[PDB]
Amino acid sequence: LHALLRDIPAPDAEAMARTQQHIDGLLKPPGSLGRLETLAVQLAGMPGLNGTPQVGEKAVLVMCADHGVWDEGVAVSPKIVTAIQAANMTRGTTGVCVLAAQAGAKVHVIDVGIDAEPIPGVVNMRVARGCGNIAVGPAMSRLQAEALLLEVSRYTCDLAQRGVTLFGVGELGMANTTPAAAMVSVFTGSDAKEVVGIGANLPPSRIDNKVDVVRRAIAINQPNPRDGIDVLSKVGGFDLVGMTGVMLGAARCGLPVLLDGFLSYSAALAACQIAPAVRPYLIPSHFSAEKGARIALAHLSMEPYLHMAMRLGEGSGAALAMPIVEAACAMFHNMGELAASNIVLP
Amino acid sequence: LHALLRDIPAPDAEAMARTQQHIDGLLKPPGSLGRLETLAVQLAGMPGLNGTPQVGEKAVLVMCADHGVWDEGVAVSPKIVTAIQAANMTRGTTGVCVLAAQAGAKVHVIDVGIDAEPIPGVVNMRVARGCGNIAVGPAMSRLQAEALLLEVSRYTCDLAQRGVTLFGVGELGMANTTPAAAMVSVFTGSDAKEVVGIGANLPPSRIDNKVDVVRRAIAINQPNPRDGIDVLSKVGGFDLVGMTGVMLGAARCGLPVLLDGFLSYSAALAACQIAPAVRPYLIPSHFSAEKGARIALAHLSMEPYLHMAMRLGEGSGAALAMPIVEAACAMFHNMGELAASNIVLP
Numbered sequence: 001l002h003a004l005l006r007d008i009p010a011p012d013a014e015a016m017a018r019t020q021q022h023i024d025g026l027l028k029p030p031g032s033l034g035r036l037e038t039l040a041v042q043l044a045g046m047p048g049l050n051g052t053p054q055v056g057e058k059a060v061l062v063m064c065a066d067h068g069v070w071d072e073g074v075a076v077s078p079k080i081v082t083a084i085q086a087a088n089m090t091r092g093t094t095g096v097c098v099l100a101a102q103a104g105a106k107v108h109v110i111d112v113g114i115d116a117e118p119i120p121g122v123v124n125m126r127v128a129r130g131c132g133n134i135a136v137g138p139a140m141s142r143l144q145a146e147a148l149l150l151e152v153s154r155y156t157c158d159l160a161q162r163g164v165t166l167f168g169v170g171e172l173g174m175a176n177t178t179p180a181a182a183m184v185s186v187f188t189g190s191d192a193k194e195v196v197g198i199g200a201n202l203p204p205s206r207i208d209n210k211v212d213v214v215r216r217a218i219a220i221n222q223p224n225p226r227d228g229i230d231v232l233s234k235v236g237g238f239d240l241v242g243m244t245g246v247m248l249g250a251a252r253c254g255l256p257v258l259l260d261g262f263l264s265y266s267a268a269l270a271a272c273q274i275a276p277a278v279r280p281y282l283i284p285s286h287f288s289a290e291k292g293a294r295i296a297l298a299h300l301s302m303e304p305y306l307h308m309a310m311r312l313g314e315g316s317g318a319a320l321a322m323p324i325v326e327a328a329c330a331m332f333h334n335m336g337e338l339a340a341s342n343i344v345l346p
Numbered sequence: 347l348h349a350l351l352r353d354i355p356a357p358d359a360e361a362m363a364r365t366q367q368h369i370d371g372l373l374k375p376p377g378s379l380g381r382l383e384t385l386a387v388q389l390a391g392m393p394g395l396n397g398t399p400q401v402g403e404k405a406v407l408v409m410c411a412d413h414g415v416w417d418e419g420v421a422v423s424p425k426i427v428t429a430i431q432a433a434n435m436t437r438g439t440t441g442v443c444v445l446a447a448q449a450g451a452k453v454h455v456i457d458v459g460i461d462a463e464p465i466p467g468v469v470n471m472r473v474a475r476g477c478g479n480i481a482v483g484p485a486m487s488r489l490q491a492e493a494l495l496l497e498v499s500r501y502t503c504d505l506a507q508r509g510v511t512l513f514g515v516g517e518l519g520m521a522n523t524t525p526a527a528a529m530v531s532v533f534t535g536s537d538a539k540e541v542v543g544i545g546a547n548l549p550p551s552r553i554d555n556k557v558d559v560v561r562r563a564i565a566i567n568q569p570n571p572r573d574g575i576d577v578l579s580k581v582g583g584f585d586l587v588g589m590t591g592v593m594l595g596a597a598r599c600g601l602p603v604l605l606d607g608f609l610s611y612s613a614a615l616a617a618c619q620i621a622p623a624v625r626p627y628l629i630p631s632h633f634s635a636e637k638g639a640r641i642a643l644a645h646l647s648m649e650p651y652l653h654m655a656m657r658l659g660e661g662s663g664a665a666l667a668m669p670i671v672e673a674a675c676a677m678f679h680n681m682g683e684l685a686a687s688n689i690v691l692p
């Protein structure tokens with residue numbers, strides 16, 4: 001794991017310089033395609049990409065797990081919805097499923113700790129039947145966190161071996177916006193009230209209780225912000241851990257990962273705390289409608305491309321941004337050149 | 347034309363109510379897909395869509411023309427770039443071309459007034475060899491504006507007959523950001539300094555001159571803000587007029603039109619002034635990096651989906667947003683339902 005972390009490659013400045021020059025010579029005013037140009041350059045620097053912006057196969061990894069903190073009354077969706085919805089993922093009827101199909105991406109459903117019987121068709125990496133209730137203690141042990149990180153990381157890099165060049169991260173876990181808020185509060189130093197949202201339609205009245213729970217979780221566990229694994233283990237969840245592991249695996253593999261929404265921002269904060277080398281592999285998708293989104297993104301120094309007021313999770317935003325990634329590649333490879341037209345612009 | 351305008355259909359509230367109900371029953375927390383849901387409902391209300399969000403064939407119409415105001419030193423691209431780039435459109439090497447191909451859309455290049463010889467392969471609707479220099483007089487006659495509006499409108503609705511269900515608008519015309527700024531200033535009541543941008547890389551020094559030109563154009567022509575045709579004719583351009591005509595045609599046809607960037611916002615302001623019934627058919631794409639973008643969008647009451655810092659034009663932003671439109675349809679038609687899973691959420 002420290003091995004793993006040690007071996008995350010730095011970006012290829014050489015490939016990036018060549019990319020920049022090629023982009024500048026395209027049939028358009030220099031810098032006119034804005035963030036699409038920046039994106040292309042970013043991809044060119046990713047070692048698993050072979051020195052050029054390119055997209056081969058695409059995968060969305062959905063980490064599913066239950067949370068003990070559900071018992072605190074912080075979520076209106078019945079607990080069983082996790083198990084149910086996870087099954088639906090196998091049937092292609094969920095939001096991520098439909099959006100991934102539209103993007104030509106494959107959905108990988110991974111059970112990291114659903115509190116139910118194993119679901120056929122779902123990848124089994126179950127830590128336990130739900131994590132500990134963070135309001136009264138830690139979500140899991142450090143050991144458990146590290147092992148999961150490891151296992152997911154490897155799974156992720158292994159897909160790379162099969163042609164996958166672009167990942168998307170997602171989750172499923174009733175009550176997950178609670179640990180997500182806890183982590184954000186911890187990593188950013190923001191007060192709970194500022195980062196606690198309505199999640200999956202929590203009634204406005206019920207908010208106060210969710211804020212109290214987050215505060216308790218923190219007071220009780222005393223997670224150390226300078227140790228991402230400490231935070232994840234104490235106030236995170238299996239699903240959050242799993243998402244962080246996808247990020248570590250893709251980066252080790254020198255490949256890009258598309259973030260999703262709020263849950264994903266929290267995992268990204270952890271990943272970056274754990275290994276700053278991860279940052280350059282991260283690509284934002286959309287701007288989550290969760291209250292704590294702005295704060296989270298500011299800390300990651302990220303500005304999403306899509307403003308859709310989305311708050312579903314599952315990796316739905318990630319899937320939706322995949323075409324953008326492909327667009328940057330198309331621009332790069334298929335546009336004509338100024339010189340070839342005898343066009344000269346300042 | 348008044349006929350044309352009179353006949354723009356209102357949206358189908360009946361279809362929209364049915365759509366809303368169907369969306370609410372999908373396998374997700376109600377309203378969780380945010381703007382994608384709103385979008386779906388919008389499309390369902392469009393009469394040419396047959397009561398449901400659907401996308402058949404896609405087309406991007408690119409209106410090309412030259413401007414006399416170029417002689418005022420408001421643009422650094424050589425005049426000839428219009429003719430050149432227009433030719434390139436036929437070769438599929440431009441930015442819109444590449445992005446449209448990615449979206450599975452067809453590009454229609456229309457010459458409404460390029461100051462050069464006719465280009466083979468380009469649709470010929472040429473008013474004149476470039477429009478009048480708005481700094482010293484009007485761009486064209488009212489008659490000319492109205493005829494073009496008419497001709498483009500019809501062309502647009504005719505494509506509908508061929509399977510096109512989604513349009514995108516674009517342009518090409520060195521110096522076009524100048525009349526675009528003039529129109530915006532006029533329609534929004536904003537001072538020129540506030541809406542004049544760098545266009546296609548105008549050096550910061552040269553800005554002052556562009557502002558002066560815009561002011562002169564206005565002072566001299568005295569365009570009436572309450573008459574969109576008056577404004578277009580006086581301080582617009584053939585390309586701007588052509589874009590407005592696509593909007594009027596799609597709306598008459600009861601079909602959706604995707605806006606592009608800055609040039610397109612100016613045309614949209616005119617179209618809406620001319621016929622408010624047009625509004626509901628308009629769909630924003632991205633948030634142009636042109637200085638006057640925010641002001642323009644505020645007046646249209648529109649919030650774009652894509653924040654890409656793009657400033658190319660050509661209909662590139664429009665093409666880039668097409669997948670989003672298709673996503674809304676996919677969501678609508680392919681997601682499973684709560685009831686079918688025995689799931690009940692507040």
Ligand SMILES: COc1ccc2c(c1)ncn2[C@H]1O[C@H](COP(=O)(O)O)[C@@H](O)[C@H]1O
Pocket residue numbers: 074075076077081085171172173174175176177178198199200201202312313314373374375689691
């Ligand atoms: C079909 O029913 C559902 C319900 C919720 C769902 C979902 C489907 N898919 C994602 N979520 C989202 O809601 C949960 C987070 O919000 P909270 O913290 O309020 O529980 C997670 O499951 C997240 O994936």
Ligand SMILES: COc1ccc2c(c1)ncn2[C@H]1O[C@H](COP(=O)(O)O)[C@@H](O)[C@H]1O
Pocket residue numbers: 027028029343345420421422423427431517518519520521522523524544545546547548658659660
């Ligand atoms: C290959 O060279 C070019 C140059 C400009 C181009 C372009 C390609 N495609 C769009 N534009 C954009 O730049 C022009 C508006 O900016 P300004 O008002 O400063 O001239 C229009 O042609 C617009 O389409």
Ligand SMILES: O=C(O)c1cccnc1
Pocket residue numbers: 177198199200260261262263264288289290310311312313314
């Ligand atoms: O932003 C998200 O991904 C999100 C917000 C609320 C509930 N589930 C997911």
Ligand SMILES: O=C(O)c1cccnc1
Pocket residue numbers: 523544545546606607608609610634635636656657658659660
């Ligand atoms: O926003 C646009 O569409 C734009 C901005 C500058 C130059 N051309 C087009």
